[PDB]
Subunit: 261 residues, 4 copies
């Protein structure tokens, strides 16, 4: 099948990628980084995140595989020592594909821009004070004052969302989760405090109150947007697909990453 | 239709129930507290919780309606002043039914007991130290040391779960959420910390380590169980049905209860 | 000097105590468990806590030393392998004494009882719902609804207080810290949420609202008190004294117990 | 006495200041904004913060007074309606002065800069990832990865510190409190999590690991510092003095600001 391999770019990852390419040469596999059907990522979660965004226009035609060369890799299923067995199983095919939900961010100006997030999308102020009205399905829910907000996919819940006190959600749940960053709460200013978990087709809109300039992050990418009228969050209709060759359940992955391994 | 009305039992609620019965007498409505199709609860959430558990064997044949006579009532949709309009709309029928998920708790001994929860089920120790192994879909996830654990339905997430730092989840999500109560974490003892959100068909089992006696709560009911071998949590296949006569969205209900009203 | 040794009571601790007694026999040291000047505790923090409460009437005439035989021991300064060096240094004397603050709990009825805590004192309800008015220096501060409250000494801040989200406080600060256990907060019920840190001479009183029966803990001891009119917390004028033979700073002790060792 | 009055600069505050100046003209009071002995601040806490920093070189010779013209004012003791009584009492003198502790921040380069904070000093990264080693009294305590750190005075504990989960500390306690902003914790990265409370003479140093550029805030002032070798926190020897004309206790001030008023 058509395939490509991204590398973190250190010596370990580059040589691992070269050896897999050499191994792939022994099968009906064509290296193609324009229209791959299989995208392998060799490095950390940052590397896997960059592989996702490199091919976010072809998510429907691609299955992803992560190899972690450090001690981490939540999106990784394979250690560097299993790489030969990965080549062989991937060549013979017959893998099972699993899909995780993604988050759609729409940014409107006074012009529209959409982004897709695998981990989360966050909003902070452009230096000044961050104040936004939070509107859920056209209902004014709260006026948020504080550092920012974080909207997470299910597989993102173990990332920034976790550090903000959010819940960890199994990725079979088509949802997104909103967490607060250092909200101000006194007798005049009130936010819900708790993380909020939204189903598909629910729309969370953030609307400016004074300043209209915000720093918006999508996974690792952070951009300053000016003249923002609205930031709109919904569960995407698009999904990321992983090639799975063995059982590595989400809650064991959580256990291995946070409890012990 | 067949109907019945439970009351909190103070003067306000008893007289409101009597006036609705008098009002219902002017329609083809039969008061029947054995096999009602409509169960009205006049009081607080405690009163609504008791109405649910009074009829938990007929959940499939019943639509519930809550009237709050205090300043509260998350499961209430109606103030006492709208009661006449409620009688009339309920008599004419043509309401829409909505369903919220429920939580199944199974308790095994060395003998089995199942319970249904609308808010949550919690586990604490019988005086001694609480230590349980947490097993998710037969995978040992963690050994929990601390005060206890709380497993919440979606509509329970605004109740005890919220006070434990859990996320608020829209009830259209068929899930349950596990929160920690004062976990011990040092270099030898480790829990995940974060709330965990589980989909349908996922099974969370709690298994004793030393003591086998636990205080188990199901909504307001708290029972000491002895010789416990396992406590098993899953999303129930049963659902509670509410009669809805107008739009009162979950997130507005959350806003009204916690932000402002 | 006069000394005594308490043991956890397993084989390791009993034989360690016997060997130290044998070692102490080679110096001008008299074993006396009625009026010791040195109290050695061999076991865990539970064992050290029991040694403190065994001699809480002679705190001014006693220096404590902890030996941890497990992997833990926040109040321990010594591993079992250093016990011979401990005997020798303790015999030669010339140690430095350090003092940590303690917490005074006063419980009034309709009759008065005082208790001294090294870790903390907690209050919960006797089965029913816990509601108390919190009065600081005779000023009504809040009405607490929830599971309970925890008042911690500085050295207790790394114990139950920590699991409740409290701050870790250096023991040179003569203070006590109040933390909430699962407080109810909605638009009608409001608590401060945050831990509160009180100086010496500040008095925190808890006063019942409906039920007057409470479960009160003092370190490991938990007693049900009936007909309670008031629970009064203040920093004690009494202090626990530790014999110190080398520098083991509080923040390194915290690092070793929670970060890495 | 020598006095001056800062104003927020809206119509309400400017006219209030003019009326107090007119009122002060009827007493032996000289308006002097170079060497005042009394500094009155008319506005919000932001206004009071700016008054403190305008005169931070003469803290020993100045007593501060806050008048809040909005609904807030933690450092304010007076509403605009009491301003005439304030002029009269301040003219007759015989007020009592109270002192709150302050925080010293030292920033070293490869050159030294010191700052004084009334609320807090915070550190974040200059766009990249924030990683610092936390050294307490020359002991390496932890390597912090996350959004940033916040070091708070006692009177700052109700401000940013509170929103970060920190404890509220009575200002008679000469301490500073360190809180985490969204720390990363997994099986490879570990921070203490809990807020840390440090006494006088304890030194907290933050030392870079990779990037040496940081955004450092001191109260409202936020500056990007380059080539930073160390950020050093200690309780200052300097104190802010407030003129007090009546009892308004700290815990009532907390109650009024966060519970009800
Ligand atoms: N954008 C600022 C860069 C600083 N963040 C950072 O050092 N994160 C890397 C660590 O997180 C792990 N990770 C990832 C990741 C990654 C790569 N990362 C770096 C890059 O791409 O350059 C971007 C992400 O970073 C996270 N992040 C940012 N700030 C914080 C914070 N304060 N606390 C916690 N996470 C934070 C956000 O969610 C970004 O999306 N996804 C997951 C996951 N699904 N589950 C469990 N672990 C996961 C990864 O293995 C490693 O252990
Ligand atoms: N079992 C000990 C009794 C003490 N609990 C108590 O006074 N709760 C009543 C308050 O909570 C509101 N509520 C209910 C409720 C109710 C009735 N309640 C009393 C009864 O039945 O006697 C039993 C429930 O109590 C909750 N609970 C227990 N302990 C705590 C705690 N520490 N913190 C927060 N909640 C707690 C548990 O989830 C029980 O199921 N469901 C929801 C909901 N879905 N959404 C939002 N508000 C809700 C209700 O309007 C009122 O404002
Ligand atoms: N009363 C229920 C018994 C269950 N508690 C329990 O297993 N605690 C033992 C663990 O905590 C460590 N510890 C102690 C201790 C001890 C002995 N303990 C047992 C006994 O005496 O039987 C009584 C204390 O327990 C604590 N506790 C109770 N419940 C919780 C909870 N949910 N979360 C966290 N702590 C809790 C309270 O503060 C009691 O005072 N002091 C400190 C300290 N100063 N600093 C750091 N670690 C410390 C000790 O090394 C061991 O690792
Ligand atoms: N630097 C970014 C500006 C955004 N911050 C903001 O709107 N804060 C104002 C609100 O906080 C109250 N306040 C102050 C204050 C003030 C003036 N403020 C604005 C200015 O000077 O322009 C600077 C301070 O802001 C705080 N801050 C910043 N970010 C957050 C956050 N995410 N969450 C909570 N607080 C935050 C920090 O501690 C700064 O020092 N001191 C106290 C206190 N001692 N006790 C209780 N309330 C207090 C004040 O009445 C008002 O209700």
């Amino acid at each position: 099948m058509k395939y490509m391999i991204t590398s973190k770019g250190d010596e370990k990852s580059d040589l691992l990628r070269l050896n897999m390419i050499a191994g792939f040469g022994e099968y009906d596999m064509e290296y193609d980084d324009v229209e791959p059907e299989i995208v392998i990522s060799i490095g950390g979660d940052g590397t896997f995140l960059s592989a996702f965004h490199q091919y976010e226009e072809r998510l429907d035609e691609i299955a992803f595989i992560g190899i972690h060369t450090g001690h981490l890799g939540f999106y990784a299923d394979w250690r560097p020592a299993e790489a030969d067995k990965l080549v062989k199983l991937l060549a013979k095919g017959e893998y099972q594909k699993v899909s995780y939900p993604l988050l759609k961010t729409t940014v409107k100006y006074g012009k529209e821009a959409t982004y897709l997030a695998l981990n989360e999308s966050t909003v902070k102020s452009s230096g000044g004070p961050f104040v936004v009205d939070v509107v859920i399905n056209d209902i004014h829910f709260e006026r948020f004052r504080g550092d920012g907000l974080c909207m997470s996919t299910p597989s993102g819940t173990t990332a920034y969302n976790k550090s903000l006190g959010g819940a960890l959600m199994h990725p079979s749940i088509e949802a997104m989760q909103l967490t607060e960053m250092a909200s101000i709460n006194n007798r005049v200013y009130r936010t819900i405090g708790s993380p909020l978990v939204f189903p598909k087709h629910h729309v969370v809109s953030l609307q400016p109150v004074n300043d209209k300039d915000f720093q918006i992050s999508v996974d690792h990418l952070s951009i300053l947007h000016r003249d923002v009228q609205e930031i709109r969050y919904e569960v995407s209709a698009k999904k990321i697909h992983f090639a799975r060759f063995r059982s590595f359940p989400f809650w064991r992955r959580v256990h291995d990453s946070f409890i012990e391994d």
